[PDB]
Write an enzyme that holds these catalytic residues in place. Structure first.
Site, PDB file in Angstrom:
ATOM      1  N   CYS A   3       0.768  -1.227  -0.079  1.00 52.61           N
ATOM      2  CA  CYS A   3      -0.030  -0.023  -0.171  1.00 52.61           C
ATOM      3  C   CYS A   3       0.857   1.221   0.000  1.00 52.61           C
ATOM      4  O   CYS A   3       1.688   1.282  -0.903  1.00 52.61           O
ATOM      5  CB  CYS A   3      -0.919  -0.011   1.144  1.00 52.61           C
ATOM      6  SG  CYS A   3      -2.471   1.086   0.969  1.00 52.61           S
ATOM      7  N   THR A   4       0.836   2.227   0.837  1.00 54.94           N
ATOM      8  CA  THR A   4       1.397   3.503   0.817  1.00 54.94           C
ATOM      9  C   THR A   4       2.699   3.392   1.547  1.00 54.94           C
ATOM     10  O   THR A   4       3.566   4.234   1.373  1.00 54.94           O
ATOM     11  CB  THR A   4       0.611   4.552   1.609  1.00 54.94           C
ATOM     12  OG1 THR A   4       0.263   4.154   2.865  1.00 54.94           O
ATOM     13  CG2 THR A   4      -0.407   4.907   0.915  1.00 54.94           C
TER      14      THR A   4
END
Ligand SMILES: [Cl-]
Ligand SMILES: [Cl-]
Lengths: 226, 226
Positions: free
Chosen positions: B100-101
């Site tokens: 993800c991030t």
């Protein structure tokens, strides 16, 4: 606020719990509790250390209770304090749920008698002596009881609970915010799809645990018979 | 023993980490570390309390490093101590990975320059200023770099790493032991499959975070330009 509780016990399979926890904690107006005999550290089977937030005595009445699985289920099946707490909360909960071998704990507590249920494939034979109607499906719903298989069962059924507690658009929004779209690189997650040689290996590795859990299950069944 | 490390930081999205941790911890002859500036409690964005096991200075050379995402990524993108540690470990690691991030942290550390990569759909525009070639795919591999999207990306790519570190039969056995066969009840895990109204809601809710991360990204890019 909707009150959601997870039982956190020594030797839990932590993903059974941490998956649904992160999904449900994303919803508005929910409060999530990690319940054990007292607040403080609890060690998962992998060695990961988690913290319980509330005790049995201080836990509020729950709308949802979730029992994860793990190695530690064997001890819980004969823990009268834990089983009594589960029974008390299940009486008024809107949803009673479990992941993987957590359904064996519901069974020991008497909550599967006459109910359709599933559990981990290697331990599925232990449902019938606990009074359940065994079903070979990944998610089984009987009234307000939901039992699911797979270490990530609780992620999926948490989206179902979000849709029924709130609405479908809320569940879809949470799924999108988490970008949840699994795509496993192998297809060996069931004994019906895995190669026979892999199934044999997995069954051999579970054999000692299954033997010990057969003994525990029979004692738990005797308590239910009284 | 294969040495696998996860960065554990305040406001992490805990499932990004706990998913792959439980899979990889199931393998033989692995040691898994939860790394922060010192051992001790670290609080995830949901309030779940996790324990870091080792400090930057005491961490052994890692074979696999994994950077999870979460709200807390913004602070990490400007933490010179954390970025220096990531760079040092990435130099010799067999696998550099993120969920993800977490790929924005790899970007701030300079490790995406000229590399194909992905990140969470709402923050995908921030890859290009960090030197990456943005790709809209769920798992992107460029050399020894793997970046994946979705809160459970690390479960899936952990099975890939198990097959490459050990063999395919080992990965399949772990999948079967965990009964891992996801089946989400909705199909809203991507902006291309979710209803338009849901996408709008999710984008609106991410807007303030995206604005703040645009500012941080530009400062991180300026440091790379020097
Ligand atoms: Cl699953
Ligand atoms: Cl995912």
């Amino acid at each position: 606020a909707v009150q959601i509780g997870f039982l956190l016990f020594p030797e839990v399979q932590q993903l059974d719990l941490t998956g649904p926890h992160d999904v449900l904690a994303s919803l508005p107006d929910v409060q999530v509790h990690l319940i054990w005999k007292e607040p403080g550290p609890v060690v998962a089977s992998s060695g990961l250390v988690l913290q319980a937030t509330t005790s049995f005595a201080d836990c509020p009445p729950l709308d949802v209770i979730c029992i994860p699985g793990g190695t530690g289920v064997g001890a819980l099946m004969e823990d009268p304090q834990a089983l009594a707490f589960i029974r008390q909360q299940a009486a008024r909960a809107r949803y009673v749920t479990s992941v993987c071998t957590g359904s064996l704990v519901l069974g020991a507590a008497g909550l599967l008698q006459g109910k359709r249920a599933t559990t981990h494939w290697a331990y599925h034979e232990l449902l019938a002596p606990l009074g359940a109607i065994p079903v070979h499906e990944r998610v089984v719903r009987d009234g307000n009881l939901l039992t699911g298989t797979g270490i990530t069962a609780g992620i999926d059924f948490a989206l179902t609970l979000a849709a029924e507690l709130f609405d479908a658009a809320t569940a879809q929004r949470v799924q999108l915010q988490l970008e949840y779209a699994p795509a496993p690189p192998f297809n060996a997650g069931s004994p019906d799809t895995a190669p026979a040689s892999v199934v044999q290996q997995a069954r051999q590795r579970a054999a000692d645990s299954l033997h010990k859990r057969r003994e525990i299950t029979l004692r738990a069944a005797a308590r239910l018979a009284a």
